[PDB]
Design a protein around this ligand. Structure first.
Ligand code: 43R
Length: 843
């Protein structure tokens, strides 16, 4: 069961999707996959340390960078500690453990076992790691801040409680019967054919078509389409893609071999996705749930089972050439046959694997077996250092083979939770490329979130983001998420519930507000009147007392600071909300600020941000900080989500709008003053100058690589404390925004050099070639990003921006003189394109 069916309503309402609904399924893959996951759930649930799980200590094995060792001049560190408006400061050794520090203190107060929390956060310093290796610590030192700790008793694990569970030789052919759309888009007698492809990693094996007929709401052929491929020459995860043309209009897929290794048979009525205008949505095995409006297509199957010598110089070298190559550089057939003939030598090169496996005639069963025997002797891969870029490459759409994909995941198993988070978003996206629901990668995500609450948390929001916005993949994700929620344990089930109700309330309000102020660049008094009036009517008796901040899960927000809440000036109407901090042990009356925004699809922003944090960890590997500000942002539902407000920052635009704010005029010395009025000391000013030269330089490089460099002033921000950063990614050319104002801070005006500018270029080029060292990674992540994150994008030209941008093939010299002349465009242009946003208000 009775209660056992409430849980299921609870789950469904947390998901925003019903994983018991069978209204849209032509088989039992999803249900089977729900059944399949209980073990690996119950596995990880059964084996997780309960107290450690509850404290989710957030921790890294990575070394402390050069820059933060210079921040320590005494091989020793200061930690204040409190009990009840009592507090003392302790000189700690950077290699000291929490448990070890309790000895130096079970010395002090009084002249059982307790634990150290951070003041204000539901973040703990526990377990056998040195303090140098907690992420909070490295955070405090970066910005130059005290470490504040309170001793309370540990979270009871009985709070993590988990609910008890309760579980041929024929050629291939296919009768195309016909199509059916109830209402026709264009009407004027047009002409229409079907196209049926057999697919395996956008490798196409065979293709057949139909005789085109008149496009009326019903079209019937009744034909057998005999393909070139043999039944026994079919691989697992081959898709029967079916498409409609006159040109592309609808598409749909059927996995030819099903999740039991069974050849697929019988009649299918399939409701088709319509094109808008390659793309992961295009890959899905899912069918359109809108049965009333959708094009659909009947078909039929009656087709059972199934489950050296020494190479010469000038060829080794061709091979090494081929292997050295980037991921997006396609293989000649000459190349592919080469990789094949010399498969066993290619096997000694882990970088060869993507290439080598995209050199398989997956359409021949004989070869795939050989390929599998090739996977047997994996000594060289199994023992190789984890290369994420390489690993990821084997997870993208190019690869559809169960076993290939699974070796990549084996490698991931060896990531620490730190790195899991880094790549979590993109790993969660990669599910779209899996041919089946149930998958080693799925299973790997599932595990690791059940293992660590932080991952678990982000995994929730990531899967929820996609479930709510996408019909192509919501069934699949929904299934995985339910699998997660069933083992995260009650505590979180409450937290998640808290969180969901709040963000569901606040989108009501968000949208309600757009309705009122039409476009009109002003926000009527009456709007704020009612914005305010609702937030009262929402706290009154309905909202939660408190809740974790989805983008920063250690922060529990409390009540709203209504006084300070508003709408923003946008053509959109975003909300500016501020909350009190539920956690009264916290140090400040400094509110929690969140923007809520309908209008742009924030999945894209999420992605750009995550990439941004990767580039940052890349610069960690050359001991480099560039002071990016990849603020918090979470996609939550349809063209809507939330954003961290960054305290004490304004818009580059607005810094112009202060002294002037004219109908579009710009001055050069103005930034520089905006810093001095905000820099109490003059030392701090030149620091603020310092922070900017980093932030500017990094944002210049990163933004050029991703190809999002030409922005408005309005969509760039600086902190009162010198930290520049771009925003609003959901939104003559110039490679990036290095304006004349940015340079008069550097001591230069359009055509000179200086002590702080010389510096800027120094950093830029160093940052730039640093990323070039991790080229393939950035290529693979961008490519996938485009494929999972975007509109439609040309499966050559859009994806391929980034290799011309990372100046591939080229030497650190040529490459530098590339990036350098990129700077001497913003010099020539200057205000020229900043100038331009507005004028085009009429062109
Ligand atoms: C308006 O749409 C957007 C989309 N994406 C990011 C943004 N920014 C995110 C970060 C941010 N921090 C701010 N801090 C202060 C004091 O104003 S404003 C702001 C806005 C806006």
């Amino acid at each position: 069961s009775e209660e056992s069916q409430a849980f299921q309503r609870q789950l469904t309402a947390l998901i925003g999707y019903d994983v018991t609904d069978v209204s849209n399924v032509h088989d039992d893959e999803l249900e089977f996959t729900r059944r399949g996951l209980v073990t690996p759930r119950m596995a990880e649930v059964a084996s997780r340390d309960p107290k450690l799980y509850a404290m989710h200590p957030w921790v890294t094995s990575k070394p402390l960078p050069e820059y933060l060792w210079k921040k320590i001049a005494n091989n020793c560190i200061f930690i204040v500690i409190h009990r009840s408006t009592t507090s003392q400061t302790i000189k700690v050794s950077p290699d000291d453990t929490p448990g070890a520090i309790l000895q130096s203190f079970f010395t002090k107060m009084a002249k059982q076992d307790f634990v150290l929390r951070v003041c204000g956060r539901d973040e703990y310093l526990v377990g056998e790691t040195p303090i140098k290796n907690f992420q909070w610590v490295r955070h405090c030192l970066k910005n130059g801040e005290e470490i504040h700790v309170v001793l309370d008793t540990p979270p009871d694990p009985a709070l993590d409680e988990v609910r008890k569970e309760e579980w041929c030789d024929r050629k291939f052919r296919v009768k195309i019967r016909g199509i059916d759309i109830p209402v026709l888009p264009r009407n004027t007698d047009l002409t229409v054919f079907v196209e049926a492809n057999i697919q395996h990693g956008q490798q196409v094996l065979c293709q057949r078509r139909t005789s085109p007929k008149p496009f009326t709401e019903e079209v019937l052929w009744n034909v057998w389409l005999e393909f070139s491929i043999k039944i026994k020459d079919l691989p697992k995860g081959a898709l029967l893609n079916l498409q409609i043309y006159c040109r592309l209009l609808y598409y749909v897929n059927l996995l030819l071999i099903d999740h039991r290794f069974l050849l697929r048979r019988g009649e299918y009525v399939l409701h088709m996705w319509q094109i808008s205008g390659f793309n992961a949505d295009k890959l899905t095995s899912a069918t359109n749930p809108d049965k009333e409006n959708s094009m659909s297509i009947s078909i039929l199957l009656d087709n059972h089972p199934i489950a050296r010598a020494e190479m010469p110089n000038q060829l080794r070298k061709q091979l090494e050439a081929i292997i050295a190559t980037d991921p997006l550089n396609p293989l000649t057939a000459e190349d592919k046959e080469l990789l094949w003939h010399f498969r066993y030598e290619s096997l000694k090169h882990p970088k060869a694997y993507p290439k080598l496996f995209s050199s398989v005639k997956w359409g021949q069963q004989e070869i795939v077996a050989k390929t599998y025997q090739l996977l047997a002797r994996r000594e060289v891969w199994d023992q190789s250092a984890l290369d994420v870029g390489l690993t990821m490459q084997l997870l993208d759409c190019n690869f559809s083979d169960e076993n290939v994909r699974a070796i990549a995941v084996q490698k991931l198993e060896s990531l620490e939770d730190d790195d899991v988070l880094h790549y979590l978003l993109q790993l969660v996206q990669a599910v779209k490329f899996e041919p089946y629901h149930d998958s080693a990668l799925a299973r790997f995500l599932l595990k690791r979130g059940l293992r660590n609450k932080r991952i678990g948390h982000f995994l929730f929001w990531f899967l929820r983001s996609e479930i709510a916005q996408s019909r192509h993949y919501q069934q699949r994700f929904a299934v995985i998420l339910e699998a997660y929620l069933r083992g995260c344990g009650t505590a979180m089930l409450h937290d998640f519930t808290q969180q969901v109700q709040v963000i569901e309330m606040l989108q009501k309000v968000t949208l309600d507000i757009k309705s009122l102020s039409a476009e009109k660049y002003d926000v009527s008094s009456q709007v704020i009147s009612q914005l305010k009036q609702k937030l009262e009517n929402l706290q009154n008796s309905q909202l939660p007392e408190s809740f974790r901040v989805p983008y920063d899960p250690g922060l529990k927000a409390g009540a709203l600071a209504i006084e300070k809440c508003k709408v923003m000036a946008s053509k959109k109407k975003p909300l500016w909300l501020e909350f009190k901090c539920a956690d009264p042990t916290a140090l400040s009356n400094e509110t929690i600020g969140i923007i809520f925004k309908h209008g742009d699809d924030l999945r894209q922003d999420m992605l750009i941000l995550q990439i941004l944090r990767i580039m940052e960890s890349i610069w960690e590997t050359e001991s480099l900080d560039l002071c990016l500000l990849p603020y918090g942002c979470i996609s939550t539902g349809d063209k809507i989500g939330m954003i961290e407000i960054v305290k004490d920052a304004t818009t580059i635009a607005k810094i112009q709008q202060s002294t002037v704010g004219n109908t579009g005029a710009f001055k050069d010395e103005v930034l520089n003053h905006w810093l001095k009025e905000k820099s109490p000391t003059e030392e701090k000013f030149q620091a603020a100058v310092e922070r900017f030269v980093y932030s500017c330089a990094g944002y210049c490089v990163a933004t050029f690589v991703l190809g999002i460099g030409d922005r408005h002033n309005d969509n760039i921000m600086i902190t009162e404390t010198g930290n520049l950063f771009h925003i609003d990614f959901g939104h003559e050319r110039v490679p990036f925004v290095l304006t004349p104002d940015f340079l008069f801070v550097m001591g230069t005006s359009g055509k000179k050099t200086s002590p702080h500018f010389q510096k800027f270029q120094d950093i830029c080029v160093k940052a730039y070639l640093a990323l070039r060292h991790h080229t393939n990674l950035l290529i693979i992540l961008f490519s996938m990003m485009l494929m999972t994150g975007m509109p439609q994008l040309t499966s050559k030209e859009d994806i391929e921006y980034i290799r011309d941008a990372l100046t591939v093939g080229k030497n650190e010299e040529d490459a530098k003189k590339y990036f350098l002349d990129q700077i001497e465009v913003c010099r020539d242009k200057g205000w020229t394109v900043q100038f331009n946003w507005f004028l085009h208000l009429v062109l």
